[PDB]
Amino acid sequence: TYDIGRVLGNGSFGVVTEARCVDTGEVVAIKKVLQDPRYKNRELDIMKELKHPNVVKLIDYFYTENRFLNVVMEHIPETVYRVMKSFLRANQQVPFILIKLYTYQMCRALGYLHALGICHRDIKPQNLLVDSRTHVLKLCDFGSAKRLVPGEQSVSYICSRFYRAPELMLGASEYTTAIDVWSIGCVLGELLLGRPLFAGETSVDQLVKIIQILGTPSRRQMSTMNPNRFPDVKPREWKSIFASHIASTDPSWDQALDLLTKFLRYEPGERLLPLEALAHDFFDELRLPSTRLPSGGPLPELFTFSQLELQNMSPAAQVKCIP
Ligand SMILES: O=C1NC(=O)C(c2cnc3ccccn23)=C1c1cn2c3c(cc(F)cc13)CN(C(=O)N1CCCCC1)CC2
Ligand SMILES: [Mg+2]
Ligand SMILES: [Mg+2]
Ligand SMILES: [Mg+2]
């Protein structure tokens, strides 16, 4: 059924190879992982549930040989990571339309996941597939994802370090899908800046870099992150962090930095929820009928909200997001 070739090379468990479905001629990605004798594979189980324009499609799966599970998923040629490095090498800002398009599609995917009670727990530019020609974006790498409900205890040391919520580094074991929302803010920040917003050398240093920009959380704020004292540090205004990028650039910066602030709240419950975030005016340009990609092509799918998405959006956000 498959012609398997070329390992694509993930930085997590399993091997992912490019392959061709000989039934369809379509290039696919196949993730091979060790399958447990007794337990279901949680990644596959989650993949079987997800049907969303901004989540990699589950195409097939089969068992090989313990044994191996092979998860056949749709193939997308690039990642937000790779797009960003281009612009970094060209010493160029990512165009605001692309930042808007990627942030919107990442919020939709994660909104859907959270509607199913699923926490992705590894949101990062490497895990966000993109096809440059259409600027579609799809979430992938569900190897760390978990069906999470509040009151559940889980591993603390869980995201990739730059995108890791502050409650996780403060040893919270009962966290929420809000940790994915902090990662969204970090990706937005990285799109605006060109380089990771908070780039710690260790997980503790990650927290310190966060505190150095946002400032010291109050003791009240500390208990929203872990109910179980930091030095006082002058925080930095966002207009200070992004000053070089602002100089070299609509009220897009006011809108982006408002959105940035609401994703990156210390208090996990105060972070702006992904589907509500879609109604932010930062995305108004995506809802204009005349808007096209910088190359002139049409926008990708943006307004095809599923029943489950709409049932998790305030009525105010529903009327705003459907044009
Ligand atoms: O097409 C796909 N369908 C999937 O499900 C899927 C997939 C499954 N697991 C992961 C983990 C991370 C990223 C993507 N995936 C891919 C998939 C698509 N590329 C992949 C690359 C490596 C890889 F290992 C898997 C894939 C290379 N690449 C990329 O930009 N990189 C590689 C990782 C660090 C730098 C960013 C361009 C396309
Ligand atoms: Mg099981
Ligand atoms: Mg099969
Ligand atoms: Mg939501």
Residue numbers in the entry: 27 to 91, 101 to 263, 268 to 288, 292 to 365
Extract from the study:
Using a forward genetic approach based on transcriptome sequencing, we identified the T. gondii GSK3 (TgGSK3), a serine/threonine kinase, as the primary enzymatic target of LY2090314. TgGSK3 was identified as a fitness-conferring gene for tachyzoites, as its genetic disruption results in a fitness score of −4.1223. TgGSK3 adopts the characteristic kinase fold, divided into two sub-domains classified as the N- and C-Lobe. Overall, TgGSK3 has high sequence (54% identity) and structural conservation (r.m.s.d. of 1.67 Å) to the human ortholog, with most of the structural variation located within loops in the N-lobe (N-terminal region).
